[PDB]
Design a protein around this ligand. Structure first.
Ligand code: NAG
Lengths: 194, 209
């Protein structure tokens, strides 16, 4: 009958890059989901396969709180059946996704005047990600028939680029913190309720 | 490092055609590849994007009529055009996008034309005169492109002006070619324009007087 550590994910001081997203595993606790959604602090709080208000009266075997940072333009892609550089090469939601996507603008916390290049995304990859695939390989992307052997140049580029977050960027070019709550099923016993 | 476009030609309105883009120096399946067309005398218009991962995007003017595909071992990018219209008449390029590093490799392209037009024949009418004087030849009502206009079978070149063709209301091209010569040499020199329209098997030598 312990309360869930949702505060530890949502209110975490530093978040992750989107290609290297986190999976805090939630287990054995009570979650007041209605405390989270009435927060009215989110520019995006869009579930799928379940209702936000009916969520309090429910249970699951495991809740997975995935959290990362992207731009506001790409928030649309944190959804089932999306394309784009984030949806394809960084974080992919299944077409049978049954959780919630939550996002809020982070330009105050996550942007430095000289430019904050701490956050990153994956720009080059030979094929799309499987659902919930995390790819942290920094291997020089090969574009030609000629292999790279860890030496940049023509047809041989670093697979990762950097977000350029400045407080004067456009609102879409601004950083948005995303938290993705994935819900499983029963058959196996449940540990998270409300 | 090349991008070689094929497939372009003439299509009636409502018909379909497929363009090819043969590559060497880059491998197509690993790259972002773009189709970008250019109508005559217009600017660059983005048409079709295709991710390394196969994700596709299309511009609204061609959404539903165009399909972008590739083929790994043949290293050839394609573009299937369906239900073609007159606006799609353009030169079509394929390029390798590096997103941040822009598009660093382009192809000279293949030309696409759309029209329920036929072929007819370029009628050559004289532009006769009556310090300096001017005479010319009016090449009118031929289609499709293009025509070659020389003067005196190539001898006279100084002062020649061959105009770019204009497309008349009938769906028919037409241009003029002129030359300024000294006003005195009107009675002594013979001026004949040489016109050739290879599509319609049409060559004409018209004397201007
Ligand atoms: C984050 O901190 C604020 C300030 O104490 C609090 O009101 C809010 O509920 C916290 N968020 C979560 C998810 O606990």
């Amino acid at each position: 009958t312990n309360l869930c550590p949702f505060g530890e994910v949502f209110n975490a001081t530093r978040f992750a890059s989107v290609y290297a997203w986190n999976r805090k595993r939630i287990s054995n606790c009570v979650a007041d989901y209605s405390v989270l959604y009435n927060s009215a602090s989110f520019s995006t709080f869009k579930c799928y396969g379940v209702s936000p208000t009916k969520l309090n009266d429910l249970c699951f075997t495991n809740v997975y709180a995935d959290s990362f940072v992207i731009r506001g333009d790409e928030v649309r892609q944190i959804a089932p059946g999306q394309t784009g550089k984030i949806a394809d090469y960084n974080y992919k939601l299944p077409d049978d996704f049954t959780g919630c996507v939550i996002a809020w603008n982070s330009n105050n916390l996550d942007s430095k005047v000289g430019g904050n290049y701490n956050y990153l995304y994956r720009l080059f990859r030979k094929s799309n990600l499987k659902p919930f695939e995390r790819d942290i390989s920094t291997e020089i992307y090969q574009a030609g028939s000629t292999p790279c052997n860890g030496v940049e140049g023509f047809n041989c580029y670093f697979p990762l680029q950097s977000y350029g977050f400045q407080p004067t960027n456009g609102v879409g070019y601004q950083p948005y913190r995303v938290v993705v709550l994935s819900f499983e099923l029963l058959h196996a016993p449940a540990t998270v309720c409300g | 490092v090349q991008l070689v476009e094929s497939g372009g030609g003439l299509v009636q309105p409502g018909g379909s055609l497929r363009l090819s883009c043969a590559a060497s120096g880059i491998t197509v399946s690993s790259n972002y590849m773009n189709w970008v067309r250019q109508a005559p005398g217009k600017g660059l218009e983005w048409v079709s994007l295709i991710y390394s991962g196969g994700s596709t995007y299309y511009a609204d003017s061609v959404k539903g009529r165009f399909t972008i595909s590739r083929d790994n071992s043949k290293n050839t990018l394609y573009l299937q055009m369906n239900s073609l219209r007159a606006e799609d008449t353009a030169v079509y390029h394929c390029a390798r996008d590096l997103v941040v590093y822009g598009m660093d490799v382009w192809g000279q392209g293949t030309t696409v034309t759309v029209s329920s037009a036929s072929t007819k024949g370029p009628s050559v009418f004289p532009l006769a005169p009556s310090g300096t004087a001017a005479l010319g030849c009016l090449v009118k009502d031929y289609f499709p492109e293009p025509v070659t206009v020389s003067w005196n079978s190539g001898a006279l070149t100084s002062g020649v002006h061959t105009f770019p063709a204009v497309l008349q209301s009938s769906g028919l091209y037409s241009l003029s070619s002129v030359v300024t010569v000294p006003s005195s040499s009107l009675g002594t020199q013979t001026y004949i324009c040489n016109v050739n329209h290879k599509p319609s098997n049409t060559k004409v030598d018209k004397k201007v007087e």
